[PDB]
Every structure is written in C-alpha cells, then in structure tokens.
UniProtKB/Swiss-Prot annotation:
Family membership: Belongs to the calycin superfamily. Lipocalin family.
Compartment list: Secreted; Cytoplasmic granule lumen; Cytoplasmic vesicle lumen
Cystine bridges: C76-C175
Quaternary state and interactors: Monomer. Homodimer; disulfide-linked. Heterodimer; disulfide-linked with MMP9.
GO molecular function: enterobactin binding; identical protein binding; iron ion binding; iron ion sequestering activity; protease binding
Protein name, as recorded: Neutrophil gelatinase-associated lipocalin
Keyword Signal: yes
InterPro entries for the chain: Calycin, LCN2/LCN12, Lipocalin, Lipocln_cytosolic_FA-bd_dom
Gene3D superfamilies noted in UniProt: 2.40.128.20
Function: Iron-trafficking protein involved in multiple processes such as apoptosis, innate immunity and renal development. Binds iron through association with 2,3-dihydroxybenzoic acid (2,3-DHBA), a siderophore that shares structural similarities with bacterial enterobactin, and delivers or removes iron from the cell, depending on the context. Iron-bound form (holo-24p3) is internalized following binding to the SLC22A17 (24p3R) receptor, leading to release of iron and subsequent increase of intracellular iron concentration.
UniProt lineage: Eukaryota, Metazoa, Chordata, Craniata, Vertebrata
Length: 178
C-alpha cells in the first residue's frame, strides 16, 4: 500500500447496477474471492492479492457480521466486521463505518449475487477526496468456472478500469477454507 496515490476513472455507486431481486438471506454465508479488479487493487505485475472469504451473516436487523479472513502476523486470523444495507439493499456500507474520520462514503454494489451462482461486486471507498474503488469476483465455493471470472474482468472494464489493476484469485496457503 501507499504507492497508488493516483485514482483511475473513479465511478460512483450510481455507475454500478443492483441485483434486481435482492434479498437479505440470499446474500448470507461464505463467499470466496475468485477474482479482483480495481485501481485500489494491489496489482503489481502478477497478483499481490490473495483470496479471502467475505462471510456475511445476518443479524436481527440485517446488519451482517461479515467474517473476513486474513493472513495476519505469521499465521491465519479472521477479522470480522459489520456490513449493513445502505440507502437500499444491495448497497453495502459498514455497520461501524458511520463514525468514519476520513471516509467520504463507503458503499458497495453487487451487480449480481445468487445462492448457487456467483457474485460480482463494485466496492466504493472514498477517503480524503481520494476514491478507492474495485470490482470483485465472489463465488459460492472454491469451484467457480472460468466463465464467470472472465465476466468480472469484463465488468472491471465497464467501470473504466484496466487489467493492470485486475488480479486473479491466488489460492491462499493459509486458513480461509471455512
């Protein structure tokens, strides 16, 4: 990090469509990263990025306790946070973002999410006039066909980004397989 001090074609939430049949519970469970795009993506040359699980678990008031998994220190560790439906279900903000110091706005849009099929998401993080934005490829398991992955890189370009900021899900050698 701290090198990409330049923002690419930074699209607002409003550039990205919503799942036309969005339901709280159809966005609950473990989703694996099967691809990643974005100017805030650490796309060095190969793939500095590595897949993790965004595990959105519903609470009483559709605040998701999302279990992110990271290789922290010299081992594996889950970092769990809250994802809450923003102004509309589909736009995702943080259950605890709302005390942000620098965060201009945080809203993610899932273009398509399914119970068996895969999910493509646009993530918008703004901070200090600097927009950090990426397009993700999430899968219902460690076994999502290359077909849907190529579709994400294509969606990556739809926001105005380039392959040079799009990496492919590295099979992490560490905890993540939930």
């Amino acid at each position: 990090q701290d090198s990409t001090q330049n923002l690419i074609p930074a699209p607002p939430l409003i550039s990205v469509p919503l799942q036309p049949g969005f339901w709280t519970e159809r966005f609950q469970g473990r989703w694996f990263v099967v691809g990643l795009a974005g100017n805030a993506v650490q796309k060095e040359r190969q793939s500095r990025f590595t897949m993790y699980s965004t595990i959105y678990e519903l609470q009483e008031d559709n605040s998701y306790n999302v279990t992110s998994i990271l290789v922290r220190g010299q081992g594996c560790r889950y970092w769990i946070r809250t994802f809450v439906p923003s102004s509309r279900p589909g736009q995702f903000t943080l259950g605890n973002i709302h005390s942000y110091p620098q965060i201009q706005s945080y809203d993610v849009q899932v273009a398509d999410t399914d119970y068996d099929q895969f999910a493509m998401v646009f993530f918008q993080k703004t901070s200090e006039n600097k927009q950090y934005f990426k397009v993700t490829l999430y899968g219902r398991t460690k076994g999502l066909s290359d077909e849907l992955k190529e579709r994400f890189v294509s969606f990556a370009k739809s926001l105005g980004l380039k392959d040079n900021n799009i990496v492919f899900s590295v099979p992490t050698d560490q905890c993540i397989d939930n």
